[PDB]
Amino acid sequence: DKAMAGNFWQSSHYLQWILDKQDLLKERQKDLKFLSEEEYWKLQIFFTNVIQALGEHLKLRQQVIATATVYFKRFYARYSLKSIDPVLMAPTCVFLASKVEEFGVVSNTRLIAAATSVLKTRFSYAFPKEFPYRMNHILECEFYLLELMDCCLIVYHPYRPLLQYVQDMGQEDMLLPLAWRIVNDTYRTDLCLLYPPFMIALACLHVACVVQQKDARQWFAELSVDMEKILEIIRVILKLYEQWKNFDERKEMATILSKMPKPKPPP
Amino acid sequence: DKMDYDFKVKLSSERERVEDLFEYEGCKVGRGTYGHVYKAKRKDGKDDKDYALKQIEGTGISMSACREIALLRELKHPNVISLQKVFLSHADRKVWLLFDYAEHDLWHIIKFHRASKAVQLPRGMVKSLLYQILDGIHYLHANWVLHRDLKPANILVMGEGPERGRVKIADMGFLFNSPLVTFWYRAPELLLGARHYTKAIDIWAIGCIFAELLTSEPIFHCRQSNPYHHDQLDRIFNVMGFPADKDWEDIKKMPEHSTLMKDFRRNTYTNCSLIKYMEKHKVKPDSKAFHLLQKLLTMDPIKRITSEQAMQDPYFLEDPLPTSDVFAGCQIPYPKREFLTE
Ligand SMILES: Cn1ncc2cc(-c3cnc(N)c(Cl)c3N3CCC4(CCNC4=O)CC3)ccc21
């Protein structure tokens, strides 16, 4: 029973941050001069995992993590990886998301300790040196994040619709756990910038149904939804896992992070 | 230092500073816990309109400011105040907000009548004011957004302009939704130690305001840390009467109930009822107004009516019907906002 729970069609998410794929690719050309298309999605997957592991350390519910991941996606959707260090942007997004969702102001010392500890423990393969930023950087970077997003803080995720579909299906025991992970996995892709969250929900449920061999064609057929757009999301989710299979993160990412464009310093 | 330089300088060059867009020097209309509020006018732009420009207190993006920005950005309804633009002053790290300026509010309007020669609030104006207050709060509640501090000073009315006499609910501030000197608009469950705000708590405040519009004085007026406040409850009971077992069955479930029984005796308020209070301020107890007021001022929160149902009350189908312009095209006697300096 969260705030703004059924306002999506007049919301800032829908009326601004559901982007055109052409425009998304066009601004991405600026970072594609250094990194290949393959190396760019491999970078998306990595910072999705960094933001995840920052959430699990700070003891944060999946929804507050999901927003942090979206903020991050929105920023670099419109700007280069040189603009602000994504190692700084990640903990700023988690810090900012926690304030918005009313989970307390995650403490300064605890926020810095989280980033420091996660990068040393679970990400040493990519980051050999310590987390170099102190809290006054997080506070500065926050001001840029809130500015780019046009102060759009409320963000709608697929989980709430997924619940409503699995309840309606009458199969919450079998499907909801697997469906919920596929929804988590959609954040490795662009899908949340390109399609509305209920459609992302519907795709994950369909893949959940296919994996578990649960026939649901009739149930899906009864929806008044554009199924071609659902098949688009399924194809991305199906690709996502083939990307997963062939992507060894821990061997590759150290090299990819050096290829990222460098921020130009003051003269 | 570690960011891209071209990126910093571009945004620095392109960022709209507040100082440069608006003339507010020596036009401070309000100063409170919220921060600083000015009556501004656009400098460069060919805009003749008046703006309320608020500087939020404290450096940075506080919990209190973050949610305020969050909700206001999504919220869009005629009777709730619309956020035009947010300015983020990077140097001092202050946050400014820009609203369409509301000249008047119920606090200042009520104060104007209460002052008097020794001219009470016109009845059609009150109905229109009430209807609009219930229209906005219903929009907030439909979106699972609670006010948590409805009072006359937060119910703004617009001055001479396109939106003449339109109500505008202001103030979207407020730890786990848990509240643990003026408690006149506070519901009794909060006084008896309710651990969470509800839609019902706001509806009580609307009744207290509606009461105040009719009588020109606060229904639960009382002298001045913990949730339990004796003298406020004493005032509520002296007006409303002490709640019988059948009126509020789950009062026993309140944390301060055992404290209430120690300190209060129900026999003391046997000659007390809302019918009697309102009668003493020349309000007929068999009037559609009174009956709505009573439904709004139900002691038991689960027996208090929703804003949805309040708008549906036949009070609003009785002559005079509520108007969009609360003044109904009548010359506005209420004085304008006096300026400040600090
Ligand atoms: C001295 N005094 N007393 C009430 C009051 C209200 C305003 C005011 C005028 N126009 C508009 N458009 C807004 Cl939004 C206003 N405010 C109402 C919300 C406030 C207060 C609480 N928290 C807030 O943010 C700011 C002032 C200005 C001076 C006033």
Q: CATH no. for residue A233?
A: 1.10.472.10
CA–CA distance, B151 with B80 (Å, rounded to integer)? 14
Asked whether A207 and A155 are in contact (CB, 8 A), the reply is no
Residue with tokens 């439904």: B295
Q: What are phi and psi of B96, to 5 degrees?
A: -105, 150
Residues A29, A4 share a domain: no
- Which of A134, A154, A174 is the C-terminal boundary of a domain? A154
Q: What's the DSSP call for residue A267?
A: -
Q: What residues does B23 pair with on adjacent strands?
A: B41
Say how far apart CA B141 and CA B200 lie, in whole Å. 10
In angstroms, the separation between the Cα of residue A89 and the nearest Cα of chain B is 11
Q: Residue B262 contacts by C-beta under 8 Å, 6 or more apart in sequence?
A: none
CB B105 within 8 A of CB B156: yes
Domain count, chain A: 2
Query: Comparing C-alpha atoms, which of A155, A164, A226 is closest to residue A187?
Result: A155
CA distance B63 to B77: 24
Q: Tell me the residue ranges of DSSP E strands in chain B.
A: 22-23, 28-32, 35-42, 50-56, 83-89, 94-100, 104-105, 155-157, 167-169
C-alpha span between A242 and A207 (Å, rounded): 14
Structure tokens given for B252: 């026993």
Q: DSSP labels for B56-74?
A: ESSSS--HHHHHHHHHHHH
Residues A109 and A184 in one domain: no
Among B209, A92, A183, residue whose Cα is nearest residue A191: A183
Write out the E strands in A10-118.
Answer: none
Residues for chain A: how many in total?
267
Q: How was it solved?
A: X-ray
Radius of gyration of chain A (CA): 19
Q: Which two tokens stand for residue A201?
A: 């929900």
CA geometry: angle A81, A140, A137, nearest 5 deg: 80
Rounded distance between C-alpha atoms, residue A120 and residue A108, angstroms = 18
Distance CA A234, CA A188 (A): 14
Chain A residues with CB inside 8 Å of B98's CB?
A: none
Residue B51 and residue B100 in contact, taking contact as beta carbons nearer than 8 Å? yes
**A196 and A259 both lie in a single domain:** yes
Residue A251 main-chain phi, psi, to 5 deg:
-75, -35
CA dist list (Å): B42 to B29, B30, B47, B98, B107: 16, 19, 6, 11, 28
Measured CA to CA, the distance from residue B253 to residue A110 in angstroms comes to 38
Task: Provide the chain B residues 75-134 that lie in CB contact (below 8 A) with chain A.
Answer: 76, 86, 88, 90, 93
Q: Give the pairing type, strands B28-32 and B50-56.
A: unpaired
Q: Which two tokens stand for residue B144?
A: 């699972």
B90 closest CA partner among B2, B7, B4, B18:
B18
Residue A204, number of CB atoms within 10 A of its CB: 29
**B98 C-beta closer than 6 A to ligand 1:** no
Does B328 contact ligand 1 (Cβ within 6 A)?
no
Which of A3, A153, A265 comes nearest B145 by C-beta? A3
In eight-state DSSP terms, residue B80 is: B
For residues A168 and A149, membership in a common domain is answered with: no
Q: By the 8 A CB rule, do B336 and B103 touch? A: yes
Same-domain status, A17 and A31:
no
* A7's tokens: 């306002």
- Give CA separation, B151 vs B89, B112, B184, B186, B255, in Å: 31, 16, 9, 9, 26
Q: Distance between alpha carbon A107 and the CA centroid of its chain, in Å?
A: 23
Q: Determine contact, residues A205/A235, Cβ cutoff 8 Å.
A: no
Among candidate residues A137, A154, A171, the one where a domain is terminated: A154
Question: Burial level of A82, CB count in 10 A (0-12/13-18/19+)?
Answer: buried
- Which of A79, A139, A267 lies closest to B60 in CB terms? A139
CA A49 to centroid of ligand 1, rounded, Å: 44
Question: Residue type at B16?
Answer: E
The residue out of A92, A123, A154 marking a domain boundary is A154
Asked whether residue A41 falls in the same domain as residue A140, the answer is yes
Bridge partner list, B56: B35, B95
Cα–ligand 1 centroid distance for B37 (angstroms): 7
**Segment (H or E) for B288:** helix B288-296
Q: How far is CA B131 from the centre of its chain?
A: 14
Q: Which residue of B has its CA nearest to A5?
A: B143
Specify the ligand 1 atom closest to the Cα of B170.
18
Catalytic residue numbers of B read: 149
Token pair of A121 as six digits: 């423990």
Distances (CA, A) of A227 to A21, A49, A87, A170, A230: 19, 30, 38, 22, 5
Same domain, A101 and A204: no
Helix, strand, or coil (residue B53):
strand
**What is the spatial distance between Cα A179 and Cα A166, in angstroms, rounded to a whole number?**
9
Residues B116, B117, B119: CA angle, nearest 5 degrees = 50
Q: Does B43 touch chain A (CB under 8 A)?
A: no
CB atoms within 10 A of CB A127: 18
Residue A142, helix vs strand vs coil = helix
Listed in sequence order, the residues at least 6 apart from B261 whose beta carbon sits closer than 8 Å to its beta carbon are none
The distance of B74 to chain A (nearest Cα, Å) reads 6
Query: Which of A10, A100, A152 is opposite residue B76, by nearest beta carbon?
Result: A10
What gap in Å lies between CA B290 and CA B299, rounded to an integer?
16
Q: Which residues contact B325 (CB under 8 A, 6 or more apart)?
A: B128, B164, B165, B166
Q: β-strand B94-100 against B83-89: which pairing, if any?
A: antiparallel
| Number of inter-chain CB pairs under 8 A, A vs B | 94
The answer on A216 and A94 residing in a single domain is no
What are the C-alpha distances in Å from A86 to residues A27, A50, A260, B219?
Answer: 17, 10, 10, 56
Burial group, residue A103, by CB count within 10 angstroms (0-12, 13-18, 19+): middle
Structure tokens of A110?
Answer: 């605890």
Q: Are A166 and A175 in contact (CB under 8 A)?
A: yes
Provide the domain limits for residue A221.
Answer: 1-22+155-267
Q: How far apart are CA B20 and CA B23, in angstroms?
A: 8
- Please give the distance, rounded to the nearest whole angstrom, from the Cα atom of residue B29 to the centre of ligand 1: 8
The radius of gyration of chain B's CA atoms, rounded to the nearest angstrom, is 22
Q: Residue B184 is which amino acid? A: W
Give the CA count within 13 Å in the CB-facing half-sphere of B274.
21
Mutate to test the interface with A, among B1, B7, B10 (most CBs of A within 10 A): B7
Question: What residues contact residue B108 under an 8 Å CB cut-off, 6+ apart?
Answer: B334, B335
Same domain for A261 and A200, yes or no, is yes
User: Rounded to a whole number, what is the distance in angstroms from the first to the last CA of chain B?
Assistant: 37
Same domain, A143 and A252: no
Q: Tell me if B99 CB under 6 Å of ligand 1.
A: yes
Ligand 1 centre distance from Cα of residue B212 (Å): 20
Question: B128 with B106: CB under 8 angstroms?
Answer: no
Look at residues A150, A53, A159, A65 and name the one whose alpha carbon lies nearest to residue A103. Answer: A65
- Cα distance between residue B159 and residue B152, in whole Å: 16
Q: Is residue B29 within 6 Å of ligand 1 at its C-beta?
A: yes
Q: Does residue A148 share a domain with residue A111?
A: yes
Structural domains of chain B, with CATH: 1-101 (3.30.200.20), 102-342 (1.10.510.10)
Tokens 């280069």 belong to residue: A80
Whether residue A159 sits in one domain with residue A148: no
